[PDB]
Design an enzyme around this catalytic site. Structure first.
Site, PDB file in Angstrom:
ATOM      1  N   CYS A  96      40.904  30.838  40.398  1.00  0.00           N
ATOM      2  CA  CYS A  96      41.879  31.865  40.761  1.00  0.00           C
ATOM      3  C   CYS A  96      41.865  32.130  42.499  1.00  0.00           C
ATOM      4  O   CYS A  96      41.026  31.774  43.070  1.00  0.00           O
ATOM      5  CB  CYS A  96      41.565  33.255  40.120  1.00  0.00           C
ATOM      6  SG  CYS A  96      42.744  34.405  40.512  1.00  0.00           S
ATOM      7  N   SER A 137      45.496  31.843  30.968  1.00  0.00           N
ATOM      8  CA  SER A 137      45.035  31.140  32.542  1.00  0.00           C
ATOM      9  C   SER A 137      43.939  30.601  32.413  1.00  0.00           C
ATOM     10  O   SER A 137      43.809  29.355  33.088  1.00  0.00           O
ATOM     11  CB  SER A 137      44.865  32.358  33.335  1.00  0.00           C
ATOM     12  OG  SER A 137      45.930  33.327  33.412  1.00  0.00           O
ATOM     13  N   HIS A 140      37.246  33.391  31.613  1.00  0.00           N
ATOM     14  CA  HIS A 140      36.987  34.334  32.566  1.00  0.00           C
ATOM     15  C   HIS A 140      35.404  34.806  32.414  1.00  0.00           C
ATOM     16  O   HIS A 140      35.164  35.039  31.208  1.00  0.00           O
ATOM     17  CB  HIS A 140      37.814  35.437  32.771  1.00  0.00           C
ATOM     18  CG  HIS A 140      39.309  35.290  32.871  1.00  0.00           C
ATOM     19  ND1 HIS A 140      40.024  35.341  34.121  1.00  0.00           N
ATOM     20  CD2 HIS A 140      40.216  34.776  31.940  1.00  0.00           C
ATOM     21  CE1 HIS A 140      41.376  35.191  33.810  1.00  0.00           C
ATOM     22  NE2 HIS A 140      41.406  34.741  32.584  1.00  0.00           N
TER      23      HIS A 140
HETATM   24  C1  LIG Z   1      48.990  33.586  36.635  1.00  0.00           C
HETATM   25  N1  LIG Z   1      48.506  32.096  36.102  1.00  0.00           N
HETATM   26  C2  LIG Z   1      49.690  31.418  35.274  1.00  0.00           C
HETATM   27  C3  LIG Z   1      49.516  31.944  33.978  1.00  0.00           C
HETATM   28  N2  LIG Z   1      51.026  31.977  33.426  1.00  0.00           N
HETATM   29  O1  LIG Z   1      48.794  32.628  33.257  1.00  0.00           O
HETATM   30  C4  LIG Z   1      47.393  31.708  36.552  1.00  0.00           C
HETATM   31  O2  LIG Z   1      46.913  30.601  36.136  1.00  0.00           O
HETATM   32  C5  LIG Z   1      46.276  32.739  37.192  1.00  0.00           C
HETATM   33  N3  LIG Z   1      45.813  33.925  36.562  1.00  0.00           N
HETATM   34  C6  LIG Z   1      44.946  34.455  37.259  1.00  0.00           C
HETATM   35  C7  LIG Z   1      44.509  35.630  36.791  1.00  0.00           C
HETATM   36  C8  LIG Z   1      44.214  35.811  35.431  1.00  0.00           C
HETATM   37  C9  LIG Z   1      43.956  37.147  35.031  1.00  0.00           C
HETATM   38  C10 LIG Z   1      43.349  38.104  35.783  1.00  0.00           C
HETATM   39  C11 LIG Z   1      43.727  37.969  37.182  1.00  0.00           C
HETATM   40  C12 LIG Z   1      44.355  36.854  37.875  1.00  0.00           C
HETATM   41  N4  LIG Z   1      44.988  33.873  38.496  1.00  0.00           N
HETATM   42  C13 LIG Z   1      45.698  32.716  38.402  1.00  0.00           C
HETATM   43  C14 LIG Z   1      46.103  31.674  39.673  1.00  0.00           C
HETATM   44  O3  LIG Z   1      46.651  30.612  39.194  1.00  0.00           O
HETATM   45  O4  LIG Z   1      45.489  31.987  40.711  1.00  0.00           O
END
Ligand SMILES: CN(CC(N)=O)C(=O)c1nc(-c2ccccc2)[nH]c1C(=O)O
Length: 146
Positions: A96, A137, A140
Site C-alpha cells: 500500500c 485489495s 492485511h
Molecule cells: C484501493 N485498491 C484497489 C481496490 N479496488 O481495492 C488497492 O489495491 C489498495 N487498497 C488499499 C487499502 C485497503 C484497505 C485499507 C486501506 C488501504 N491500498 C491500496 C493501494 O493500492 O495503495
C-alpha cells in the site's frame, strides 16, 4: 468475552486459547477488556487475484493468494516475537502507498473502509494487532493505534 471472541483448545498443547473470528487474532490470555472512530495502521500483501495487482514495490504482482498468506504469517511471527516491529515491516513490505507513513491510515468512521477491514478495525482493542484479514485489495495485518 468481547465482540468476536471464542474459546478454543490448542492443537499442539491441549491448552485453552482465545480466537477472534472478526480480526483473526489469537492469544493465550482471556480477553478482559464501540467508539465512533478508530485509528489504524496496516501492512498489505497483494496477490495475483487482488483488485489492483500492482504496487510501489512491484509493477506486476504475481504471487498467489497462498504465497501472500505465507508472507503475512511470517510478518505476524516476527512482530509477535519482537524480532521486528510492525512499522518497520509495513515501511519495507506493505504493497500500500501508506507504507511511506509506516502504514498509518489515520482515523476513520464506520462506512469508509472495505467491510472486512472496518469490521476488524472496530473489533480490535487500542494497541491490538489483527491476524490475516482478507479484502479485495489483498491480505492485511491491522494495528489499531487509537
Ligand atoms: C484501493 N485498491 C484497489 C481496490 N479496488 O481495492 C488497492 O489495491 C489498495 N487498497 C488499499 C487499502 C485497503 C484497505 C485499507 C486501506 C488501504 N491500498 C491500496 C493501494 O493500492 O495503495
Amino acid at each position: 468475552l468481547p465482540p468476536g471472541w471464542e474459546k478454543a483448545m490448542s492443537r499442539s498443547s491441549g491448552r485453552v486459547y482465545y480466537f477472534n473470528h472478526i480480526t483473526n487474532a489469537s492469544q493465550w490470555e482471556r480477553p478482559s477488556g464501540e467508539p465512533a472512530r478508530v485509528r489504524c495502521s496496516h501492512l498489505l500483501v497483494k496477490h495475483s487475484q487482488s483488485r489492483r495487482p500492482s504496487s510501489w514495490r512491484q509493477e506486476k504482482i504475481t504471487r498467489t493468494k497462498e504465497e501472500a498468506l505465507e508472507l503475512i504469517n511470517g510478518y505476524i511471527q516476527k512482530i509477535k516475537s519482537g524480532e521486528e516491529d510492525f512499522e518497520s515491516l509495513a515501511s519495507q513490505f506493505s504493497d500500500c502507498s501508506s507504507a511511506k507513513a509506516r502504514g498509518d491510515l489515520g482515523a476513520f468512521s464506520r462506512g469508509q473502509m472495505q467491510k472486512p477491514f472496518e469490521d476488524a478495525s472496530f473489533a480490535l482493542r487500542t494497541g491490538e494487532m489483527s491476524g490475516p484479514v482478507f479484502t479485495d485489495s489483498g491480505i492485511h495485518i491491522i494495528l489499531r493505534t487509537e
